[PDB]
Amino acid sequence: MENQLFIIGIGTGTDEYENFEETILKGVKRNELEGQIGPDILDNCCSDVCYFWGRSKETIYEKKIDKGDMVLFYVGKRISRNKVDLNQETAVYLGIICETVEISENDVSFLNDFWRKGENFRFLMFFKKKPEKLHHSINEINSKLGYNPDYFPIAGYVKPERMSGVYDILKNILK
Numbered sequence: 183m184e185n186q187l188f189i190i191g192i193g194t195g196t197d198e199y200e201n202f203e204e205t206i207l208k209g210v211k212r213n214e215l216e217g218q219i220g221p222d223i224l225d226n227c228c229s230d231v232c233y234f235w236g237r238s239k240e241t242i243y244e245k246k247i248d249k250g251d252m253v254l255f256y257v258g259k260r261i262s263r264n265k266v267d268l269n270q271e272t273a274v275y276l277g278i279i280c281e282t283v284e285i286s287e288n289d290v291s292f293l294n295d296f297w298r299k300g301e302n303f304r305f306l307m308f309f310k311k312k313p314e315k316l317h318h319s320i321n322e323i324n325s326k327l328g329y330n331p332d333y334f335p336i337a338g339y340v341k342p343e344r345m346s347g348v349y350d351i352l353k354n355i356l357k
């Protein structure tokens with residue numbers, strides 16, 4: 183595996199989902215970022231509107247998130263540590279990272295334009311195409327990956343021995 187696969191769990195009914203809807207599902211016009219994100223990033227990675235997500239750290243499970251890495255956004259009702267409510271609606275989105283941008287702690291104010299508490303989430307990942315809504319539930323994707331059906335991490339790293347089982351499917355979705 184030359185790239186990595188991460189799972190990010192977006193809890194519905196929380197500010198996290200509101201932020202996700204804003205910048206991953208809807209996206210933002212490029213002019214909302216001009217003056218704050220360098221034009222190189224915007225040129226290379228905003229195909230029309232810009233799509234991006236942000237986190238408090240550069241790493242997940244101690245793995246650095248790199249451009250070219252893939253992200254499964256799990257969307258559902260968080261009901262316990264690492265568990266989703268499978269009797270409520272769930273969704274999964276698949277993105278591939280075009281670029282990563284670390285915003286300095288001193289430069290986070292613009293993130294509040296877009297996100298509740300945005301200034302906390304200064305490790306940004308950009309997606310050139312809107313992450314693709316998959317046909318499958320969280321429980322079907324977890325099953326294919328060998329996880330328990332209701333697995334719902336805040337941030338998870340999919341080890342290569344598991345990622346390998348689904349890697350060719352994921353590449354074909356994203357092509």
Ligand SMILES: [N+]
Pocket residue numbers: none
């Ligand atoms: N908007």
